[PDB]
Amino acid sequence: MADESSDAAGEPQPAPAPVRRRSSANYRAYAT
């Protein structure tokens, strides 16, 4: 494409959901 706005004019991709760190950051802090 020529313009960088084709992302919205064409097919927009679904945003990935962020993972929580309440169990991954507290569990890794005890080991590492």
Swiss-Prot record:
Origin superkingdom: Eukaryota
Residue segments, region Disordered: 1-24
Modified residues (N-acetylalanine): 2
Positions carrying Phosphotyrosine: 27
Residues bearing the modification Phosphothreonine: 32
UniProt family annotation: Belongs to the troponin I family.
Subunit structure: Interacts with TRIM63. Binds to actin and tropomyosin. Interacts with STK4/MST1.
Protein function: Troponin I is the inhibitory subunit of troponin, the thin filament regulatory complex which confers calcium-sensitivity to striated muscle actomyosin ATPase activity.
Entry protein name: Troponin I, cardiac muscle
Organism expressing this protein natively: Mus musculus (Mouse)
